[PDB]
Amino acid sequence: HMCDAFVGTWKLVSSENFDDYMKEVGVGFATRKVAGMAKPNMIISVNGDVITIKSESTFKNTEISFILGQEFDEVTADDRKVKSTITLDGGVLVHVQKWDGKSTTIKRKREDDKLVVECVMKGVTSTRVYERA
Ligand SMILES: O=C(O)[C@H]1CCCN1C(=O)Nc1cc(Cl)cc(Cl)c1-c1ccccc1
What we know:
The protein is mainly beta. The protein has helices at 18-25, 29-37, and strands at 8-16, 41-47, 50-56, 61-66, 72-75, 81-89, 92-99, 102-111, 114-121, 124-132. The relative contact order is 0.23.
């Protein structure tokens, strides 16, 4: 029951500072502009200890499956090859991605009926707000 309140199908409804977050990460112009239009569906499910998170949109369909605390390989929507570790900290899913000596953290939090996603790269934060689909 570790992630019960995250499980479901969620749809992006608002974004703030996302272009600047992508810039900070190193995403190129064309990907930023196209990817910035997308309104992804985030689909979270749990089976035993395995959590699966899918992101489906016009831009890209991605899927990760993982066990909390156990590092895995991930190819991100913007084609970075990263080493990812996802943990639960005080009820927040904390996803750290490492590549090329860089690091970014993505936090997923339940707030009221929303799932609020905070993406941080150095001093730049972006907030992506999802509602139930
Ligand atoms: O898209 C999101 O809301 C954020 C928070 C959850 C994971 N996530 C990303 O990895 N976003 C993204 C993060 C980066 Cl640096 C670049 C892109 Cl292209 C996306 C992206 C954009 C549109 C659709 C899919 C991915």
